[PDB]
Amino acid sequence: EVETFAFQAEIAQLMSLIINTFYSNKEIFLRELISNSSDALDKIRYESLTDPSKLDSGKELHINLIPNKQDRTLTIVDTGIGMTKADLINNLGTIAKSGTKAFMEALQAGADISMIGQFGVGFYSAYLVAEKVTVITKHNDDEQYAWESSAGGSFTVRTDTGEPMGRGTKVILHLKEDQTEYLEERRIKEIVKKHSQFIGYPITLFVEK
Ligand SMILES: Cc1cc(-c2ccc3c4c(cccc24)COC3)nc(N)n1
Numbered sequence: 018e019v020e021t022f023a024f025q026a027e028i029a030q031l032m033s034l035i036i037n038t039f040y041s042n043k044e045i046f047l048r049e050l051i052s053n054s055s056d057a058l059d060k061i062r063y064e065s066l067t068d069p070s071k072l073d074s075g076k077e078l079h080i081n082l083i084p085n086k087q088d089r090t091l092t093i094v095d096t097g098i099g100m101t102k103a104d105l106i107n108n109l110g111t112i113a114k115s116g117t118k119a120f121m122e123a124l125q126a127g128a129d130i131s132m133i134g135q136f137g138v139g140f141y142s143a144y145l146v147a148e149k150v151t152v153i154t155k156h157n158d159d160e161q162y163a164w165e166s167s168a169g170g171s172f173t174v175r176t177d178t179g180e181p182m183g184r185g186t187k188v189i190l191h192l193k194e195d196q197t198e199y200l201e202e203r204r205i206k207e208i209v210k211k212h213s214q215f216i217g218y219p220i221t222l223f224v225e226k
Contacts, residue, residue, distance in 0.1 A: 019175045025111040028141075029170045031121060035144045036168060040130045043196070046146050047205070048212035049139030050093040050188050051220065054080045057097020057186060058218050064098065074157055074184035079219045082209070084200040086225060089192050091146075091199050095218075096185040099156035102174065105164050109140070109152065110172060140188075144168060146199055149191035155182045 024032065058078045065071045075096050083092035100108060107113050116136030123132065133139050143150045152164040161181055166172035190199075198204045205222055213220065 019173050021171055021173050022106065022110055023171055024166075027112055027117050027121070028110065029168075031117050031138060031141055032144055032168045034121065034124065035130065035141050038124075038130065040145065042129075042131055043145040044199075044208050045131050045133070045212065046142040046190075047093075047199070047208045049134050049142045051080060051209075051213045051216055052134060053140055053188075054093060054095035054097055054186070055216050055218060057095055057099070060098040061096070061184070071157055074155070079221065080216070082205055082220065082222045084202070084205065084223065084225060086197070086200050089194075089197065089200070091190045091192060091205075093188040093190075094182075094185065095187075096183065099182075099184050099186055100154040100162075101156045101159035102162050104156065105152070105154055105162055105174060109164055109166075143188065143190055146192055146196040147190040148193050151187075151189040151191070153177055153180075153182065153187040153189070155184050155186075157184060 058080075061071065062078055077096055079096055081094040083094060085092070112118065115138050117138055120128070120133065120136035120138055123136070124130075130142070130145070133142050149165065149167040153161065154164070155161040161177045162174055163177040164172060164174050192199060202222065209220055209222070
């Protein structure tokens with residue numbers, strides 16, 4: 018059973034600005050997704066101090082980068098706190114706690130897209146390189162869900178079965194045809210070293226089979 022939702026207007030406008038603005042420095046999407054993973058990892062690490070059973074779904078706190086040239090996908094996996102169904106819909110479909118409004122105003126007052134992370138909307142930079150994004154998430158308090166969007170004002174949410182994660186989030190980027198450089202090992206290594214060298218969790222770049 019697939020549920021379809023409309024993005025809150027300001028979120029649809031933000032995605033459209035990301036998709037339509039001529040902006041060449043697209044590589045920043047990776048540090049923005051890695052930053053979200055690091056924050057989710059900080060949250061599970063903190064909660065598990067006072068409740069060690071929150072780690073029964075997995076003790077390892079890490080980030081995995083999975084390129085796949087055959088599928089034309091780049092996946093960012095973490096074992097962070099994850100999102101419940103309600104967190105998934107609110108965080109991704111609405112302004113929520115974000116600085117969506119300030120970011121859009123900032124862009125008219127001289128800011129540039131690389132500054133997206135200052136406004137709690139870095140996830141949307143995924144749309145600089147991806148035609149479609151699939152988000153698989155498992156929080157300790159809920160079942161596993163798949164969120165999906167190719168923009169155009171809507172997104173879907175369904176339960177996800179058959180490949181259960183213990184806990185965390187998987188951001189699957191179905192890359193645009195001209196954005197395949199982001200599947201190259203030396204390109205990924207270069208971006209991680211340039212923008213994510215200070216992340217306090219291991220970042221493993223998977224090798225293709
Ligand atoms: C628990 C969690 C949440 C997020 C996340 C995804 C997408 C959006 C987020 C926002 C705020 C906080 C976290 C996220 C707002 O923009 C979308 N990412 C990861 N990796 N993990």
